[PDB]
């Protein structure tokens, strides 16, 4: 209990409280003030950040006071109430994460793909419902004293206003643990593993080419040096801006002035990728290699025709022969031994991998909408990494009470507590939240 331990642990607990509060009001302020961040996914994130803000203000400081003082100095009424809020916050967090997982599944399986089927009205209704049901399953078994144990060590701690050690009967510690944590966790891990499976299997040429070519609504110059716009649409071979601006207006049918809209860029991208497949079926050297290939490897060939041209890809006489004979790794080395690989290495390696593996693993989490699914997977993933050891030691204590000490029980609970401050830092992955944070912090 040395002076450097109590002050040392006192400082880190104080910093943990500050990092949780600051970080979460930052997230709540960002979604409430910036319209770009006003989505149904972010509505569940503000629900998650609220529980985290309640954690850092109402549970973590009183928990820190219980460790340093080695006793409870807030009475028996605030003891039960503090514990009830604590349980409510963890239940609401995992259930909102479960709701996000389900919402993301219904979105990816819908033709909208990355848009939720829920409106903002029903999303709010879903959010207050998790808090009403969580509030009922968290406050009622504690206020009614259904959680209470019948052994001497327990009953004496309830009577003492100095004690607030969570003593429970084996029935509450199993029922509340599976209903408030294990059931939403199992559903979340099973449902969110499917959203990752869907995102990868549903990858097509349109998403693949948006990864490789990108999207720039303004007229720019590519790696080759020629003028390009939208998703890899070459305008002219002429090194003249007005020459490229003239051929731009002729493609849309209006005075563009060099600026294009998403509707126009997508329309131009659709006819471009259609011209790429049209050229393959007309070219005598590319037509049989296309028929021999599979749906995913066909996209890799279309991609090559989109970038280099129909006659360009027909030059790989050896590589095309290898693709028909289905000698993927032997095709890869010849494709590596090219000017195309030297000029665009990050793009070529992905297309070459797609020919080898015959999967979308090279284009794994490359799309902006996929990064958003990865970020949400990290939010869910760290939560279970932080809470699972505490919830495992909780369902082990019921079978054998002497197997684990009280010192390791609080430590694993605090591993779950520090999670409440990680979520805001994980949102820095999104550029929308990054731009929001910088503006609110005035940097
Ligand atoms: C211990 C108890 C009293 C604290 C509970 C606090 C309640 C009132 C808070 C915590 C989380 C909150 C929700 C967080 C998310 C949203 C989405 C937002 O776009 C509209 C409001 C709404 C729906 C909030 C309403 C109020 C809410 C349910
Ligand atoms: C030390 C940690 C303790 C401080 C905790 C929270 C401060 C919150 C900081 C977030 C910045 C204030 C929000 C803001 O930027 O203000 C809105 C502004 O009017 C634009 O609309
Ligand atoms: C402490 C409790 C709550 C802090 C949450 C911060 C309140 C949310 C920020 C609201 C805000 O200031 O934004 C105004 C916006 O312009 C309106 O549309
Ligand atoms: C005490 C904590 C109270 C925190 C209350 C924060 C909930 C309100 C909020 O996040 O604002 C969303 C806004 O309504 C979107 O338009
Ligand atoms: C079990 C978890 C149930 C949680 C309910 C989630 C509801 C949801 O996400 O909505 C799906 C879809 O939009 C409905 O049309
Ligand atoms: C911090 C490490 C993140 C652990 C979460 C996890 O299990 O990884 C799944 C994630 O979606 C992989 O991108
Ligand atoms: C804790 C000490 C408070 C210092 C506040 C601070 O660091 O400023 C916030 C931000 O950098 C403002 O641009
Ligand atoms: C033990 C103490 C200090 C009250 N912390 C509670 C934990 O942070 C999490 O509590 C829970 N949230 S949802 N389900 C639970 N539990 C964990 C404890 O045993 C009963 C059910
Ligand atoms: C103890 C209470 C400490 C901090 C909670 C207050 C923080 C709320 C600031 C909101 C200001 C705003 O963004 O409009
Ligand atoms: C109980 C299992 C609930 C299944 C949720 C729907 C998502 C899915 O079909 O994979
Ligand atoms: C196993 C325990 C936790 C995994 C974290 C939750 C994220 C879903 C997993 C993704 C996947 O399996 O593809
Ligand atoms: C990083 C998280 C590590 C420590 C947070 C401090 C809480 C430690 C609780 C255990 C105290 C004890 O009983 O020894």
First-last Cα distance: 42 Å
- Beta content comes to under 5%
Spatial extent as radius of gyration: 29 Å
What characterizes the major β-sheet? 3 strands, antiparallel
Describe the strand arrangement of the main beta sheet, using strand numbers: 1-2-3
Q: Per the principal axes of the C-alpha atoms, what is the gross shape?
A: elongated
PDB class: membrane protein
Keywords: COMPLEX-LCP method, xfel, LCP-SFX, beta2AR
Assembly: monomeric
Entry title: XFEL beta2 AR structure by ligand exchange from Timolol to Timolol.
Topology of this structure?
Layout: H1 3-33, H2 40-68, H3 75-108, H4 120-143, H5 152-159, H6 172-201, H7 205-213, E1 216-221, E2 227-230, E3 233-236, H8 241-252, H9 262-282, H10 287-292, H11 295-308, H12 310-313, H13 317-324, H14 328-336, H15 339-343, H16 345-357, H17 368-397, H18 406-417, H19 423-426, H20 431-441
Antiparallel strand pairs: 1-2, 2-3
The structure holds cholesterol (CLR), (2R)-2,3-dihydroxypropyl (9Z)-octadec-9-enoate (6 copies), ligand TIM and oleic acid (4 copies).
One (2R)-2,3-dihydroxypropyl (9Z)-octadec-9-enoate binds next to loops.
Describe the structure.
With 443 residues, the protein is mainly α. The chain folds into 2 domains: 3-202 and 374-441, Rhopdopsin 7-helix transmembrane proteins (Up-down Bundle); 205-363, Lysozyme (Orthogonal Bundle). Helix content is 71%, strand content 3%. The protein has 20 helices and 3 strands. The chain has helices at 3-33, 40-68, 75-108, 120-143, 152-159, 172-201, 205-213, 241-252, 262-282, 287-292, 295-308, 310-313, 317-324, 328-336, 339-343, 345-357, 368-397, 406-417, 423-426, 431-441, and strands at residues 216-221, 227-230, 233-236. The chain has a 3-stranded antiparallel β-sheet. A hairpin with a 2-residue loop joins strand 2 and strand 3. Helix 1 runs antiparallel to helix 2 (40-68), helix 6 packs antiparallel against helix 17 and helix 11 packs antiparallel against helix 16 (345-357). The longest helix is centred in the N-terminal third of the chain and has 34 residues, at 75-108. The two termini are 42 Å apart. The site of one oleic acid has 8 residues, from helix 6 and helix 17.
């Amino acid at each position: 209990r040395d002076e450097v331990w109590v002050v040392g642990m006192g400082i880190v607990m104080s910093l943990i409280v500050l990092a949780i509060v600051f970080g979460n009001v930052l997230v709540i302020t960002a979604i409430a003030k910036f319209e770009r961040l006003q989505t149904v996914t972010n509505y569940f994130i503000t629900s998650l950040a609220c529980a985290d803000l309640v954690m850092g203000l109402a549970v973590v400081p009183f928990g820190a006071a219980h460790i340093l003082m080695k006793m409870w100095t807030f009475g028996n009424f605030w003891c039960e109430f503090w514990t009830s809020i604590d349980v409510l916050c963890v239940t609401a967090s995992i259930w909102t994460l479960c709701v996000i997982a389900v919402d993301r599944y219904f979105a990816i399986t819908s033709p909208f793909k990355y848009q939720s089927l829920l409106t903002k009205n029903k999303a709010r209704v879903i959010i207050l419902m998790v808090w009403i049901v969580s509030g009922l399953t968290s406050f009622l078994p504690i206020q009614m004293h259904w959680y209470r144990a019948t052994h001497q060590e327990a009953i004496n701690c309830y009577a003492e206003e100095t004690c607030c050690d969570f003593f429970t009967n084996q029935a509450y510690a199993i029922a509340s643990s599976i209903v408030s944590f294990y059931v939403p966790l199992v559903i979340m891990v099973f449902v969110y593993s499917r959203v990752f499976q869907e995102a990868k299997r549903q990858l097509n040429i349109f998403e693949m080419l948006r990864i490789d070519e990108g999207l720039r609504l303004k007229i720019y110059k590519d790696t080759e040096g020629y003028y390009t716009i939208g998703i890899g649409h070459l305008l002219t071979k002429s090194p003249s801006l007005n020459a490229a601006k003239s051929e731009l207006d002729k493609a849309i049918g209006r005075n563009t002035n060099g600026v294009i809209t998403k509707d126009e860029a997508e329309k131009l991208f659709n006819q471009d990728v259609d011209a790429a497949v049209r050229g393959i079926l007309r070219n005598a050297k590319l037509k049989p290699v296309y028929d021999s290939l599979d749906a995913v490897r066909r996209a890799a060939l279309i991609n090559m025709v989109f970038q280099m041209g129909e006659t360009g890809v027909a030059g790989f006489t050896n590589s095309l022969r290898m693709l028909q004979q289905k000698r993927w790794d032997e095709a890869a080395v010849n494709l590596a031994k090219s000017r195309w690989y030297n000029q665009t290495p990050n793009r070529a390696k992905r297309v070459i991998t797609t020919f080898r593996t015959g999967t979308w693993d090279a284009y794994k989490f490359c799309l902006k909408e996929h990064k958003a699914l990865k970020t949400l997977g990290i939010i869910m993933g760290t939560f279970t990494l932080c809470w699972l050891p505490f919830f495992i030691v909780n369902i082990v204590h019921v079978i054998q009470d002497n197997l684990i000490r009280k010192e390791v029980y609080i430590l694993l609970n605090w591993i779950g507590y520090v999670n409440s401050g990680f979520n805001p830092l994980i949102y820095c992955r999104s550029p929308d939240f990054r731009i929001a944070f910088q503006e609110l912090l005035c940097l």
